[PDB]
């Protein structure tokens, strides 16, 4: 899509239960959707058990709509109206999320 570089872990859509009950997981971002990524997983949640998503992973798109430039709250809007299932793309990005945790 762009070129050849580090980070072999390619993006993949993870299956999650009805977003309505997707509270187990959290979302963190900045302004003007500078970069929204997964915050942390809560054990017992639907996305935690059904999905293998964890802290550090980056979100590219949800249920279709891309959240690459979606604000912090803007992302929640997509998850809220997720429905029965929301396809979220995950990709190894410890440095990207590391920006938040300092």
Describe what you observe in this structure:
The protein is an alpha+beta fold. The chain has one domain (1-102): Pdz3 Domain (Roll), CATH 2.30.42.10. Helix content is 19%, strand content 23%. The protein is built from 3 helices and 6 strands. The strands form 2 sheets. Strands 1-6-4-5 form a 4-stranded antiparallel beta sheet. A two-stranded antiparallel sheet has the order 2-3. β4 (58-62) and β5 form a beta hairpin. The chain starts with 11 loop residues before the first strand and ends with a helix. The PDB classes it as signaling protein. Keywords: Signaling protein. The assembly is monomeric. The entry is titled "Impact of IR active probes on PDZ3 and its ligand binding studied by NMR and X-ray crystallography". The protein: Disks large homolog 4.
User: Helix count, per DSSP?
Assistant: 3
Write down how many β-strands occur, each being a DSSP E stretch of 2 or more residues: 6
H-E string: EEEHEEHEH
Number of separate structural domains: 1
How would you classify the helix and strand content by structural class?
alpha+beta
Rounded radius of gyration (Å): 13 Å
Question: How does the overall form come out from the CA principal axes?
Answer: globular
Strand content: 15-25%
Question: What is the helical fraction, as a range of percent?
Answer: 10-25%
* Sheet with most strands: 4 strands, antiparallel
Question: How far is it from the N-terminal to the C-terminal residue, by CA?
Answer: 31 Å
Q: Describe the strand arrangement of the main beta sheet, using strand numbers.
A: 1-6-4-5
- Which CATH first-tier class would you pick? Mainly Beta
Q: What is the correct CATH architecture?
A: Roll
Mind telling me the CATH superfamily name?
A: PDZ domain
Query: According to CATH, what is the topology?
Result: Pdz3 Domain
């Amino acid at each position: 899509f762009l070129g050849e570089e580090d980070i072999p872990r390619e993006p993949r859509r993870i299956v999650i239960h009805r977003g309505s009950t997707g509270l187990g997981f959290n979302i963190i971002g900045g302004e003007d959707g500078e970069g929204i990524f997964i915050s942390f997983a809560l054990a017992g949640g639907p996305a935690d058990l059904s999905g293998e998503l964890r802290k550090g992973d980056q979100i590219l798109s949800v249920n279709g709509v891309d959240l690459r430039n979606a604000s912090h709250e803007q992302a929640a809007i997509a998850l809220k109206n997720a429905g029965q299932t929301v396809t979220i793309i995950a990709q190894y990005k410890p440095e990207e999320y590391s920006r938040f945790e300092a």
